[PDB]
């Protein structure tokens, strides 16, 4: 397995958590988190000529999801987090060993 | 070493920690999350007969310990965390490389 | 790549992040955590002579870094970090197979 973080805008959530249920992944957890962001600042010259950075608000995403499903997770997550606009966040992939389900003590492992 | 990170209903909070404390189990660290769960509706079929996904509260739990302990954790974990209905949560297995500890700057790595 | 993680104390925050800042590192997120700690009792004989171990606050600190730079960033971190006291915190380093970019796709990746 794989897991899959990213770091997103909060307002873009419902987009992203509704794209990735619809397309069939209802696994996530979702998390605030803060981190550094730019902040446009007054000017006269054009937008963005000046700016801060400011530690501010973000949301942390958290899919397991088996090694070949993560492409498609990730192409969905960037569809719907993307702005275009600096600051849009990043996707972390890690390695996830196993998973044991609560409820029964089911067991999904990686082999050597 | 290894990461045990494990998604609770957040009324089993204490149960779950209790039982890892007195396990000799004491480094784990807690945050609220939130994710998919159902929620039962209304009927005079049957219990479950219909019910909704919703977003809801959780609980990630934490914990990084020896290879040689992460069975013993997780049998902890699901015995307590279990209540047998469905949205138990999981438990997902990672790697960690080393440890540092802030305070005195000992080191624990693991060997290629 | 490779996931840092920290966890502090929560007045050690601004010290850290700034920190970490100035010496050009800016991609940290934050969550509030709660974890065990050490709580000082009543008493004539000595400091520390009694106390309690509680649930409370800490912080946890993410940041995902080259291969290269994770010695240096565990240095900023255990030197701003530190206060000498039990319950400085921990540090786990763990490994991230790769980075996308979501504003415009790019992608980081480790070889096999
Ligand atoms: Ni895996
Ligand atoms: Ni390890
Ligand atoms: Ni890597």
Redesign the pocket.
């Known amino acids: 397995?794989?897991k899959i973080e990213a770091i997103i805008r909060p307002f873009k959530l419902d987009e992203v958590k509704i794209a990735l249920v619809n397309a069939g992944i209802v696994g996530m957890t979702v998390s605030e988190v803060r981190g550094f962001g730019r902040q446009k600042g007054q000017t006269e010259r054009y937008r963005g000529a000046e700016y801060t950075v400011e530690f501010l608000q973000k949301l942390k995403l958290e899919i397991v999801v088996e090694?070949a499903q993560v492409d498609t997770v990730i192409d969905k997550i960037v569809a719907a987090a993307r702005t275009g606009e600096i600051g849009d966040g990043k996707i972390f992939v890690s390695?996830?060993?196993?998973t044991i389900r609560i409820r029964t003590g089911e067991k999904n492992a990686?082999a050597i």
């Open positions: 397995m794989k090694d390695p996830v060993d196993q990686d």
